Amino acid sequence: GEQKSYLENQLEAVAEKTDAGYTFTFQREKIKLLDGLEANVIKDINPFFHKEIDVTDDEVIITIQPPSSYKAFRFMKAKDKKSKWQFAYQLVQAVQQHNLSRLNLIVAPENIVFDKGLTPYFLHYGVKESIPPYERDEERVWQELKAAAALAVDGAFAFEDYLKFNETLTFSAEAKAILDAESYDDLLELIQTHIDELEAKAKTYIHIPRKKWNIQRYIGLGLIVLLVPALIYSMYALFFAQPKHQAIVDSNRAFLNKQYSEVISTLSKYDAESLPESVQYQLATSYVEVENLGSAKTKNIENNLVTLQSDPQHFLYWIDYGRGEYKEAISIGRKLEYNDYIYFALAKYKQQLLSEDTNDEDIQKELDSVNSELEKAQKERQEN
Amino acid sequence: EQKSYLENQLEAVAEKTDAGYTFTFQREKIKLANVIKDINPFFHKEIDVTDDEVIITIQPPSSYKAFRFMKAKDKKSKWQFAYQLVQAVQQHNLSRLNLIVAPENIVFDKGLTPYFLHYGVKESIPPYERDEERVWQELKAAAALAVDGAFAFEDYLKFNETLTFSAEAKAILDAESYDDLLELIQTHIDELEAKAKTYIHIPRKKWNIQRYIGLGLIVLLVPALIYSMYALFFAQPKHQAIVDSNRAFLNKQYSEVISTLSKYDAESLPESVQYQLATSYVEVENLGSAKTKNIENNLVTLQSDPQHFLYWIDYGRGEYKEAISIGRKLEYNDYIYFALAKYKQQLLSEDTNDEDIQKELDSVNSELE
């Protein structure tokens, strides 16, 4: 199924690409050479293109060899949109600027080659009443031009789709604009606005080598993963660690001045286990002092139970008792096996539970646990 | 009043009015120009012959821009324009029309194709005759001006070994033929396309926003890192030292208080910590039981002048000249005499050539008697 191209069907010629150049072979019957020149006029358009004409008793072979750097139309499809619209602007201009009277155009893709400057060139030209296209056909050339421009810019369909079946196929917005042009200046203005819009868009863009762009991105992301711990630590050091140091300085100053109530208020927002053992000692002796027990009872606690060399559990007991945390202090008293710590905290816990209503079944169960231990220790301490 | 290159070569005044590009010559230098209308028929061309002037007016289509508008385009467009400029000169075949490849004579369309405004006429309008060598040098200078743009047209055209040209400008100006020059431009176009493949394209607004975000992160990270370094390596070890010396003070371990706060200056420590450090220096001094009792409950107390703490820390650290000044400030004669005596002992056991020590020893002995 050797299906022929548009150029081949229109001229009734075989178009091929050999090492010698582009071949356009016609039948002698369809070529009228009435002068002596043998279609010598075709060499007057692109003198830089090597042009040969072979006339035999039954065939006419035209050979066009453009410079090696010139590429066939098919190589436009892979270029960028800016280049496509520049090629289409220059393709319309080359058709519009054609003035050679004896030479007739055929705007087909198989007939176009372009240079490094994206300028299009036609390989085969018809000769007036000699080589097809025999006569000028402005309407045929106009429709060929809009289909070639649409094929080069859109590229969604083949040249014959844009050219012949135009009122049947759902074309692109860019291709419909090209194919619906009513004049050369209208199409040139349509193409110019697309070039102008692309050039304007490109001006608002920066072009960075991917390696440089990527290293700047990892630098920026590295700054973020370094700023989140530095900010979080700074917040802790400024709003938690620094005011704790000043509180430890202030509570240690108030302790030396026997201002036991001031030590309590200065360290009131801190948990006993967060404070150092020496600070725990000072807070516990301050709670013991503020408790206002007997002179002899206080003397027993301060030099036998809550000393700088005693179990830090003794400090935790008096801080819990001093902060109204009796259920917590009772557990500490049970751990140290000190029955006086258990009984003295159980008595205060009973009053704390008694302040709560007698309609909370959890409070009544806890109050029944306390009352049983207080009546057990009273009969034991009074006998032995 | 030096004119432009085009003006000096043709002996004409070149201007741009609303009617088009003006090229006015003197009647005497114009020899009897309808051939001028055969190159760009799309350009409106008029010739006015006055009794002493010939004014040529070329009006290309509105969309065509002057040579000066290439400078703001991208390098790829500048190379493509140069390619088509070399081709326009190479393809010029009209025998009676002569070229002048000057920037003030070139315009270009949306497809970057260059066009010449004024053409000379054979033995009629300058350039009167063809000059292939002048045209070749004009072309390479115009191509170099359009592509490089670092210097003016006359600098590239000068063709002298005086100006240190760019590598691209030198390549264009050193071309030996039209094909050598076209191929030279082609490899530069091909090398630009290959370089473009390794590039990412970010909208300038997006790239600028993240640059200020990134710079804002740096101005926020330097104070956060510096504060974190201070809090971790200076503020935290000082808090632990204050905790440790306050624990040792409560345990009557006066020598331990001294060694815990030894790396800190007395004025950097809080007043309560200064008190504990001073009473520790007083205790370590090992004075009399009664003498120590007088100091601890009359001079170095939690409610006394912090200068008393500074005196005992200076005395305890061998800073006798500093302690003497503090004793003089508090007007306490016992603080002056007791520090002057230890300063005399420090000066003793050094050398028998210290006249400054003998003068200081004579000052202390007179006040004690």
Residue numbers in the entry:
A (entry chain A): 3 to 386
B (entry chain B): 4 to 35, 41 to 377
Task: Pull verbatim passages from the article behind this deposition.
Taken together, these results provide a comprehensive picture of the network of T7SSb subunit interactions and identify YukC as their interaction hub. Altogether, our results suggest that pseudokinases have three key roles in the T7SSb secretion mechanism: substrate recruitment (LXG and WXG effectors), energy coupling (based on the cytoplasmic interaction with the ATPase, the dissociation-prone PK dimer, and the flexible β-swap region), and signal transduction (through the transmembrane stalk interacting with the putative pore-forming subunit).
The YukC structure can be subdivided into four main regions from the N to the C terminus: the pseudokinase domain (residues 3 to 206), the β-swap domain (residues 207 to 211), the transmembrane (TM) domain (residues 220 to 243), and the extracellular domain (residues 244 to 384). The YukC structure reveals two unexpected features: a β-swap domain and a twisting stalk. Analysis of the dimer’s interfaces on the PDBe PISA web tool shows that YukC dimerization is mainly governed by the intermolecular interactions occurring within the stalk (solvation free energy gain upon formation of the interface [ΔiG] = −22), including the TM domain. The β-swap is located below the membrane plane, where the monomers cross as antiparallel β-strands. The symmetry of the structure is broken at the level of the pseudokinase domains, which are oriented differently in the two monomers. Interestingly, in the YukC structure, the orientation of the monomers diverges below the β-swap. This asymmetry is related to the different orientations of helix α8 in the two PK domains, favoring the H-bond between residues K205 of chain A and A80 of chain B (red asterisk). As a consequence, the PK domain of one monomer (chain B) is closer to the membrane plane than the other. Taken together, these sequence and structural analyses, as well as in vitro ATP-binding assays, suggest that YukC is unable to bind ATP (and to hydrolyze it).
